[PDB]
Design a binder for this molecule. Structure first.
Ligand SMILES: Nc1ccn([C@@H]2O[C@H](COP(=O)(O)O)[C@@H](O)[C@H]2O)c(=O)n1
Length: 387
């Protein structure tokens, strides 16, 4: 059968790993490929070098029907090599299964490779701490069978359903935290169930690439030479990480901008509660969707070096360019960082958190369970004095 590789991800981390897989296989210029990476654009100077390369929009975390137009161009027997975001795997594969239904004679699923979205998978797993995980797996497997037979989605445990694909297809899972699955006691049944179908995320794959493939990869992920040089000075580095807000209200976005500037000052100013000392070069890493929030920092701070905000932070993990220290507002990007590199992580007030909620939320709990952070490194945003 002819193999078609599908790279699907609405987010960042899976895409980063999928673009590594493409780079590792980039000598094959005609292997059929379909890219559905909402946050990444393959430069046309690379697209033109490949044949049978296709692109599909994602909408509501699934490929659009435009996928069918692509697959119709391959009228023989086809086996699908599918790369997915774990958290969104059920929706991402939905149009693929629908197409297979219409072409059961010639379309088969060869294998799945699944990659963590980031913190969201582990948080979601925390909320299942009190469940009979062994029973949830069996039910999820049963309901995955119904999905595969009817095309209709109904999971009593949508979270555990993300981890039962091996009951249907050859699968390999790539986890940001293998420790979590091995340390969390309530997850022991799941760890044993997954058996030899998971592995730790290949963060050091970039180091095994060829010199030219390394440059290939950096072009795919938007990390140009100028930014690289900046993060290679022989100086103690601290990177301040920013955040964003859904709200459109100018007013509110302005408050988030003013408050993130204040948080920066708590790290970098001597009177600050989070002062890291005088011996660090300071970088700012805005949130990709920060918009004016990011401009507020650069326009009103000083002695800071900007790292373009649309770069996914996790690139620095995939490339070995992490700083000595990272600090800022809680983000998925922290789940993937070494413990000794964390200064302080700050939390924003919302529905569940109106105080340093005794750290009774899953995010901190996961991090503490894994030992990435201690209580002294958790900060509630509103408790910080206005400097
Ligand atoms: N300062 C930041 C904040 C977020 N991000 C990107 O945004 C993604 C979503 O992060 P949040 O958990 O903060 O929404 C992160 O996984 C990372 O790829 C970033 O690259 N720099």
């Amino acid at each position: 059968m002819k193999t078609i590789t599908l790279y699907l991800d609405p987010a960042s981390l899976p895409a980063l790993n999928q673009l590594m897989d493409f780079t590792q296989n980039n000598e094959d210029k005609t292997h059929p490929r379909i890219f559905g990476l909402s946050r990444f654009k393959i430069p046309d100077n690379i697209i033109t070098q490949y044949q049978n390369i296709h692109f599909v929009e994602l909408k509501d975390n699934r490929p659009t029907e435009a996928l069918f137009t692509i697959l119709d161009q391959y009228p023989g027997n086809i086996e699908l090599n599918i790369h997915l975001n774990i958290a969104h795997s059920v929706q991402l594969i939905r149009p693929i299964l629908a197409y297979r239904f219409k072409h059961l004679d010639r379309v088969s699923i060869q294998q799945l490779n699944l990659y963590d979205n980031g913190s969201m998978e582990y948080v979601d797993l925390e909320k299942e701490e009190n469940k009979d995980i062994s029973a949830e797996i069996k039910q999820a497997e049963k309901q995955l069978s119904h999905y595969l037979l009817t095309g209709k989605i109904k999971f009593d445990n949508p979270t555990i359903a993300r981890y039962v694909w091996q009951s249907a297809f050859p699968v390999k899972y790539h986890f940001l935290s293998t420790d979590y699955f091995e340390k969390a006691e309530f997850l022991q049944p799941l760890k044993e169930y997954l058996a030899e179908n998971y592995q730790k995320m290949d963060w050091t794959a970039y180091q095994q690439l060829t010199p030219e493939q390394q440059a290939f990869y950096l072009t795919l992920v938007g990390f140009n030479d100028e930014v690289k040089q900046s993060l290679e000075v022989q100086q103690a580095k601290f990177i301040f990480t920013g955040t964003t807000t859904w709200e459109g209200n100018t007013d509110v976005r302005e408050y988030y901008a003013q408050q993130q500037l204040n948080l920066l000052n708590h790290f970098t100013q001597a009177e600050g509660d989070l002062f890291i000392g005088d011996h660090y070069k300071i970088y700012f890493k805005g949130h990709p969707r920060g918009g004016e929030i990011n401009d507020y920092i650069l326009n009103n701070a000083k002695n800071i070096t900007n790292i373009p905000a649309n770069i996914s932070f996790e690139v620095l993990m995939m490339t070995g360019l992490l700083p000595d220290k990272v600090g800022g507002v809680a983000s998925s990007l922290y789940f993937s960082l070494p413990k000794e590199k964390i200064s302080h992580i700050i939390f924003t007030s919302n529905k569940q958190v109106k105080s340093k909620d005794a750290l009774n939320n899953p995010y901190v709990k996961v991090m503490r369970r894994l030992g990435i952070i201690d209580e002294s490194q958790v900060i509630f945003w509103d408790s910080l004095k206005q400097l």
